[PDB]
Amino acid sequence: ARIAGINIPDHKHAVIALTSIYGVGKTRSKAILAAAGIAEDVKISELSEGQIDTLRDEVAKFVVEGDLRREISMSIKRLMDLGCYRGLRHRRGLPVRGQRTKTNARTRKGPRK
Amino acid sequence: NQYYGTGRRKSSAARVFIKPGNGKIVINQRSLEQYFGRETARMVVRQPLELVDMVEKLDLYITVKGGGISGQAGAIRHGITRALMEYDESLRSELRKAGFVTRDARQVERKKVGLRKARRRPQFSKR
Amino acid sequence: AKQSMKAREVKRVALADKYFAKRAELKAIISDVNASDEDRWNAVLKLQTLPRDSSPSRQRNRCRQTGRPHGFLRKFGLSRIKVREAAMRGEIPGLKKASW
Amino acid sequence: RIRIRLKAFDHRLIDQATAEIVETAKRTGAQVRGPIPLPTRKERFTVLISPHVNKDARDQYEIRTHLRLVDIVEPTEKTVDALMRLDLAAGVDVQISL
Amino acid sequence: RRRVIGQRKILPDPKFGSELLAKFVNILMVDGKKSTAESIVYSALETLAQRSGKSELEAFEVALENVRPTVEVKSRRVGGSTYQVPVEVRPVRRNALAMRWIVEAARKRGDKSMALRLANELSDAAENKGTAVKKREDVHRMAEANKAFA
RNA sequence: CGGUCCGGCCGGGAACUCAAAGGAGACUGCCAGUGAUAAACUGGAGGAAGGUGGGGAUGACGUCAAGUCAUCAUGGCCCUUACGACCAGGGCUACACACGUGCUACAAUGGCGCAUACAAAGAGAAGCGACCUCGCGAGAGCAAGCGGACCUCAUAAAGUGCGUCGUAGUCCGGAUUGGAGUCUGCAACUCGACUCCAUGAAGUCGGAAUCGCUAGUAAUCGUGGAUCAGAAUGCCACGGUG
RNA sequence: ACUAUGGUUUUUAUU
């Protein structure tokens, strides 16, 4: 139990603790289920050491675990100047993509008093 | 003798033959319960058939095409009564007693102008 | 509409027959990325924007008895206030409120 | 190889023009395909009618066409020529193809 | 005799043992989606016989004998005055109302929906306990504090 | 009714439909009763249908301190070295706060997975573009079929069957957040539509009150079309369930 | 004679 899923429900479906975690969602969860060739319907296969933990290499070509944000957390510091539209909108909590502020902005502005 | 009846309802059209003989029912060259089994109108065609008792002395042969199941079933029910009232003209008095010899009060009318489906009432809140 | 618009009308269409209506089947086939080293068309795409006031998006279909780009029916060339008379004066083939 | 179509904007005008060519079809071949009735086409329009807004005031129109195929059924230069003194009727359109 | 009665409208079921069925499965039914309201026949009472005691032959018969409306109180015209009067609950309604009136706890009990809700509200109703029963005796006394003319 | 290891398929035939057109039947006509043997109301035979059979065309006199110089006409007022008209860039999603009408929902009258039934009305002259293929994918490549009751847009959904969720802001839900694309147009900072893999917060049926229907009626599911370079959830048609 | 149940019609302007 918990050989890849980090949560205590160990008798349930192959999405539980195996999606939206450390750079893995449905599409990349399928890609390591495919790497080990195992079964997924109703429950994930009961498995031992040296069977799928050895195959994390077959899904490694993405930002994962300790590397999920590491280098972008330095690259995103590159623009900070107040005259730069991207610099200012990194230096303050603002959308670099641009949005409307007058009407239907209440998620970004948060709750009103 | 072969007693004939036509029936039609909402883009569907059916033909019925009634004969004296062995108590059988055939539809589109299939059994009555060969392809129907979950459809909400599949029993309404039986309504006039118990009035003379079922599947003991009368032969039924039905053909149908067009429309959907609630249309086909209503077309077939009236096609059955139009054939059954030829088989015995004293059944006319009994088919009136259950409403089965009249075209029902639901039929397709032409699209009322604009206004989406043109049947709903639009906004009239006073705000 | 401006009084200049009926002079602009015949100037726009003459520029479109000179250029746009004679280039439309060429502009669709210069989208090539197969030539070996450098591009062969990159310097001539600017012909889409070279004449002034003439372009297919400015040159809308327009109403043909009134000076409007908007509120029209293409199969007649008319607006509702001219269709209400033309449907009573036809002329326009088959146009009637039934009754044959 | 050739194809013919006859279209009219009135349900009596389609007969007036078909009557030239269903009788031409009796001066050729040995069996005729009649008018070949085809489905009628209905073009509709829903419009506004008030001088200003009034969303409860709306109006509608329809333009319907009747189409006959006939089929010329045999290669004869005299039978295709029957279409050359026919399209001039007010509300008729003849379309020859191939 | 031609136009007489007219008979049927609905027919009695040999297995359900109640004529309320044609108005009982009309409850929590939206946009004509009947099978999502008929989901409680041979399921919810099969679960009630596994959540409160044994058998289901009289549970729905006795619950609606314990929760029984008999009177209703309205402001009614004699002209021009509009006196409050008690009126008896009409015979075709008398046992068909209470089965639709258990709603003021449905979003609060956490009973895990439909057939599992029904398997809990009936074990209170079969003692005249729980939801809406204090309001039933409040109407019974609303008609005791004034009996009008009869 | 021939050919029929037995298909509207080929010959044939329009019975039955459909596309339609030209045209019917119903007059209070016939009976009971109430009521004033009038009218009308409630019942009934005959008929497919009757006492608004279902549905839709309407502005009698008069009225409102009603709208419109903007359908169209045109007085006056004002500018007339200009508020006229030409020319290029700009503005019309510039932001603060309260909404009127909508919408995905708040979970199980629901989702997730997987298979699966029953359609009409339209669009199609560098069109609609199949089969197949590349690309994670938007989209694009290669080229049939048909100029279109036939081909192509075009795998209807809700529903139905078998598993699953254990009622919790959740396997729910998805504003966000990141890196790069696909498509269009002088133009996408501001101010467009679409996509891939990650990534993430609210929402717990709505305060006084306000609005819809007497039945194919309130409610609800899916497909087209116009304007049009790219862009609608509004507009106009159509079919399914109850 | 009995829905138990809502105060009272602003200073006052003058195309």
Curated annotation (Swiss-Prot), chain A:
Gene symbol of the encoding locus: rpsM
Pfam families: Ribosomal_S13
Source species, domain of life: Bacteria
Keyword tRNA-binding applies: yes
One Gene Ontology CC term in the entry: cytoplasm
Protein name: Small ribosomal subunit protein uS13
GO molecular function: rRNA binding; structural constituent of ribosome; tRNA binding
Region of interest called Disordered, as start-end residue ranges on this chain: 93-113
Entry's transmembrane regions: none
Gene3D superfamilies linked to this entry: 1.10.8.50, 30s ribosomal protein s13, domain 2 (4.10.910.10)
Protein task: Located at the top of the head of the 30S subunit, it contacts several helices of the 16S rRNA. In the E.coli 70S ribosome in the initiation state was modeled to contact the 23S rRNA (bridge B1a) and protein L5 of the 50S subunit (bridge B1b), connecting the 2 subunits; bridge B1a is broken in the model with bound EF-G, while the protein-protein contacts between S13 and L5 in B1b change. The 23S rRNA contact site in bridge B1a is modeled to differ in different ribosomal states, contacting alternately S13 or S19. In the two 3.5 angstroms resolved ribosome structures the contacts between L5, S13 and S19 bridge B1b are different, confirming the dynamic nature of this interaction.
NCBIfam families xrefs: uS13_bact (TIGR03631)
GO annotation (BP), single: cytoplasmic translation
Quaternary structure annotation from Swiss-Prot or TrEMBL: Part of the 30S ribosomal subunit. Forms a loose heterodimer with protein S19. Cross-links to the P site tRNA and weakly to the A site tRNA. Forms two bridges to the 50S subunit in the 70S ribosome, contacting the 16S rRNA and proteins S19 and L5.
Family classification: Belongs to the universal ribosomal protein uS13 family.
Swiss-Prot record, chain B:
Keywords: Ribonucleoprotein, Ribosomal protein, RNA-binding, tRNA-binding
GTP-binding among keywords: no
InterPro entries per the UniProt record, alphabetical: Ribosomal_Su5_D2-typ_SF (IPR020568), Ribosomal_uS9 (IPR000754), Ribosomal_uS9_bac/plastid (IPR023035), Ribosomal_uS9_CS (IPR020574), Ribsml_uS5_D2-typ_fold_subgr (IPR014721)
Gene Ontology molecular-function annotations: RNA binding; structural constituent of ribosome; tRNA binding
Pfam families associated with the record: Ribosomal_S9
Cysteine-cysteine disulfides: none
Cellular component per GO, a single term: cytoplasm
Signal peptide: none
A Gene Ontology biological process term: cytoplasmic translation
Stated role: The C-terminal tail plays a role in the affinity of the 30S P site for different tRNAs. Mutations that decrease this affinity are suppressed in the 70S ribosome.
Subunit and interaction comment: Part of the 30S ribosomal subunit. Contacts 16S rRNA. Cross-links to the P site tRNA and weakly to the A site tRNA.
NCBIfam families for this protein: PRK00132.1
Family: Belongs to the universal ribosomal protein uS9 family.
Protein name as annotated: Small ribosomal subunit protein uS9
Biological source species: Escherichia coli (strain K12)
Curated annotation (Swiss-Prot), chain C:
Keywords assigned: Ribonucleoprotein, Ribosomal protein
Keyword Ribonucleoprotein belongs to the record: yes
InterPro entries: Ribosomal_uS14, Ribosomal_uS14_bac/plastid, Ribosomal_uS14_CS
PROSITE patterns noted in UniProt: RIBOSOMAL_S14 (PS00527)
Biological processes annotated in GO: cytoplasmic translation; ribosomal small subunit assembly; translation
Keyword Ribosomal protein: yes
GO cellular component terms given for this protein: cytoplasm; cytosolic small ribosomal subunit; small ribosomal subunit
GO MF entry, a single one: tRNA binding
Family: Belongs to the universal ribosomal protein uS14 family.
UniProt function note: Binds 16S rRNA, required for the assembly of 30S particles and may also be responsible for determining the conformation of the 16S rRNA at the A site.
Quaternary state and interactors: Part of the 30S ribosomal subunit. Contacts proteins S3 and S10.
Protein name: Small ribosomal subunit protein uS14
Record gene name: rpsN
Curated annotation (Swiss-Prot), chain D:
Gene3D superfamilies assigned to the protein according to its UniProt record, in alphabetical order: Ribosomal protein S10 domain (3.30.70.600)
Keywords in alphabetical order: Ribonucleoprotein, Ribosomal protein, Ribosome biogenesis, RNA-binding, Transcription, Transcription antitermination, Transcription regulation
Keyword Lyase: no
SUPFAM superfamilies attached to this UniProt entry: Ribosomal protein S10 (SSF54999)
GO cellular component terms given for this protein: cytoplasm; cytosol; cytosolic small ribosomal subunit; small ribosomal subunit; transcription elongation factor complex
Residues in the signal sequence: none
The UniProt record lists the keyword Hydrolase: no
GO molecular function, one term: tRNA binding
Transmembrane segments: none
InterPro entries found in the cross-reference section: Ribosomal_uS10, Ribosomal_uS10_CS, Ribosomal_uS10_dom, Ribosomal_uS10_dom_sf
Pfam families (UniProt xref): Ribosomal_S10
GO terms, biological process: cytoplasmic translation; regulation of DNA-templated transcription elongation; ribosome biogenesis; transcription antitermination
PANTHER family reported in the protein's UniProt record: 30S RIBOSOMAL PROTEIN S10 FAMILY MEMBER (PTHR11700)
Subunit text: Part of the 30S ribosomal subunit. Can also form a heterodimer with the transcription antitermination protein NusB. Binding of S10 to NusB is mutually exclusive with its incorporation into the ribosome. The rRNA transcription and antitermination complex (rrnTAC) consists of RNAP, NusA, NusB, NusE (this protein), NusG, SubB, ribosomal protein S4, DNA and precursor rRNA; S4 is more flexible than other subunits.
NCBIfam families the record matches: PRK00596.1, rpsJ_bact
Family: Belongs to the universal ribosomal protein uS10 family.
Protein name: Small ribosomal subunit protein uS10
Species annotation: Escherichia coli (strain K12)
